[PDB]
A and B are shown apart, each in its own frame.
Chain A
Amino acid sequence: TSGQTYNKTDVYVDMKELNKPVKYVEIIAYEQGSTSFDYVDIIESATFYLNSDEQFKTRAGEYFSLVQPYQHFKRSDPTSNISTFSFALDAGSFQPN
């Protein structure tokens, strides 16, 4: 209220506006001011809730960046810090896996 800004130790994204069957999600982070490309990994761990129920055991950020993509393409982080989470065996297939 007073206009003070404080950093969040724990920050969550509310996926409440999304009402569709989702194949996968993609997660990035970037500087608020530099609204440009070249993404950064600032995530130590992440977990997923549906109606306040855990969906899986909290995993480290490296899991989401390096491991999870195996399901689909570009499981690498040479300059990329793009992490994903899938709800399907593959993301790329046209078929609604």
Chain B
Amino acid sequence: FADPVPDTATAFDVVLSRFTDKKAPADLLKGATFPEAAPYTDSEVENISKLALSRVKGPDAPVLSFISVEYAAKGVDNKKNTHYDIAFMVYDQVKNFSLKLVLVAVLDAKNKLWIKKFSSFNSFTPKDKGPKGVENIDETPLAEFIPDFVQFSRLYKDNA
């Protein structure tokens, strides 16, 4: 169940992953595809985030205090697998700051909670965005001289 932390991740996200459920529940919840969403329920989502924070009690775990939820996305399939995709704010009471966490978790018919994802809102640690960026707009980088066949540097290397 769930995913391994991406090979490239911050320490904060590796700890959050350490606390996810990588093992299937009864591995019975395979029966139907995608949820139906018609809830106008609010306070229920606050409790799911609180429960995910109630799961973090590591000897090296940050103190995590609940703030609030947005994008409380819920729906349930017809096998009573309740899917949540929750974005919420948490306060670090020791280092003085708040982050947004992403919680993707499910309930079974017995309302036991398993966490599929627990991570920082921000992603793409490597910062491989296509665009590179320019320090000057009115600067045109000088055009690469396309060399003759040998590329010069190999020509002096071959010629002793």
Contacts and interface: CB of A to CB of B under 8 A. Distances in A.
Interface of A: 89-90, 92-95, 97
Interface string B136-148: 0110100000000
A91 to B, nearest CB: 10
A75 to B, nearest CB: 16
Interface residues of B, number: 4
Majority SS at the chain A contact face: loop
A89 B137 CA distance: 9
6 closest A-B pairs by beta carbon, nearest first, are A93-B138, A93-B137, A94-B140, A90-B137, A97-B137, A95-B137
A89 B140 CA distance: 15
Given A95-B134, A95-B138, 12 more contacts: A89-B137, A90-B137, A90-B138, A92-B138, A93-B137, A93-B138, A93-B140, A94-B138, A94-B140, A95-B137, A95-B140, A97-B137
Contacts of A93: 137-138, 140
Interface string B50-70: 000000000000000000000
A82 B138 CA distance: 23
Contacts of A90: 137-138
A61 B134 CA distance: 33
A25 to B, nearest CB: 19
Interface in B120-156: 134, 137-138, 140
Contacts of B138: 90, 92-95
Contacts of A89: 137
A38 to B, nearest CB: 30
Contacts of B140: 93-95
B141 to A, nearest CB: 10
Nearest to A72: B138
